[PDB]
Amino acid sequence: SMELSFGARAELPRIHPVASKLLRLMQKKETNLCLSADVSLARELLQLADALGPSICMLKTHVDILNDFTLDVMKELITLAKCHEFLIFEDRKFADIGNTVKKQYEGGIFKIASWADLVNAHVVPGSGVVKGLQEVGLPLHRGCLLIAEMSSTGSLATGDYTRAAVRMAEEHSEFVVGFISGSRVSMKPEFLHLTPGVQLEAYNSPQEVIGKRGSDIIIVGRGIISAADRLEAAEMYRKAAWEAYLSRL
């Protein structure tokens, strides 16, 4: 008779465990916010995670720009994720053949699969990209997001491409938990939709993204603003996005 809450979706029979965990945290903390940690140093990453952890459901990392990466830094981040209750999403945009991405996900110096709840992939190589990641991620109970649409000028992720991304997700629903897209690309409530939003400040508003287009999670930049202003902004943004979610219910 109506739209499903995040909590209701977390109980669906075919829900992915990582999706369910995420949905329950969103419901509990009343947050739709995925914070982008686009920083170059471990101190910046950990301090941002500590300060803004309470306001977010997810922290999006790029470990390959972290100048002083170590696995110990990642362990500290995981502790913050557990203490403040958010998932870690490594925005690596895996985009190679299956045999290569398997090693890039499990191996090298980053050991991404050992700490990242979620990673994402481009679907251009075909389903082998998902298959390779799944080989590593499934035994570790990880999830994956597929990039189905993009807001950038000249994006080729439209039409049949977007439909192909959705088909891939369905073919690998033991591992793929959702999409990064500008709007809903599937009616199946087990899939999460993450969508870019306007950055924090002291068509991309939470009201349009979450309220009108029905995305689940808004991806927000940290803003070029003070820490005091950032903390205040994060809470105002969280409330606005949450209210938008409630309005659609």
Next chain:
Amino acid sequence: ELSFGARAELPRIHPVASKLLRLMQKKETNLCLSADVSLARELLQLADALGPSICMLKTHVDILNDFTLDVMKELITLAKCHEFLIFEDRKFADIGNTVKKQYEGGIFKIASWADLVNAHVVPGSGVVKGLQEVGLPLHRGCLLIAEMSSTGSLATGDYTRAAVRMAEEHSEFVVGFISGSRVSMKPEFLHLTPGVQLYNSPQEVIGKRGSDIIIVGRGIISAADRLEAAEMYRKAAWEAYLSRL
């Protein structure tokens, strides 16, 4: 139809492409080694032993369990001595400040040692635009992924045409394509073809379908005698090339 040496002297040739084409002619090689190993020692041994047989060494730095930047500085010394380009097969796909930092910074410092990198076109020209801000001052080049070798690849039809257009629009930085066949008729662009072995034979790829450089991994890397294998592939690819002049 045009020789590599002649293409090296074209007016609109990119300096990196010219450098590559001249060493290809000097060494009679159009072979790119896919150095798919997880240990720094294995990477350097392959580069030393097989450097003389190849025009290019293709790396995945993010698969090395024991990466350090000193490893890549030693790789540069081998590249300079044995005369080959270093191609980091990173398949960049982000845009803006992120892709710039992924190319220049973090632990890998890719732009400091890779002559060539590659980029996807799916996000639009933002990937190339970001990379170019870093790479152009450093006299680097880029390859665009126009087709892929994998089952279910979506890099077909209009996608492939978009890649070619993007290359033409960024010819100050883009020197060619990863593709299964010739996709541009402009001789200033190089074509590199993945998954070559023994349709994926050197003679088909280079001899009939018009690609320039074969990328070979397992056929050399897992061979009982790697140097013998490398020369075998080099000779096959080079003869395929001469066959079409």
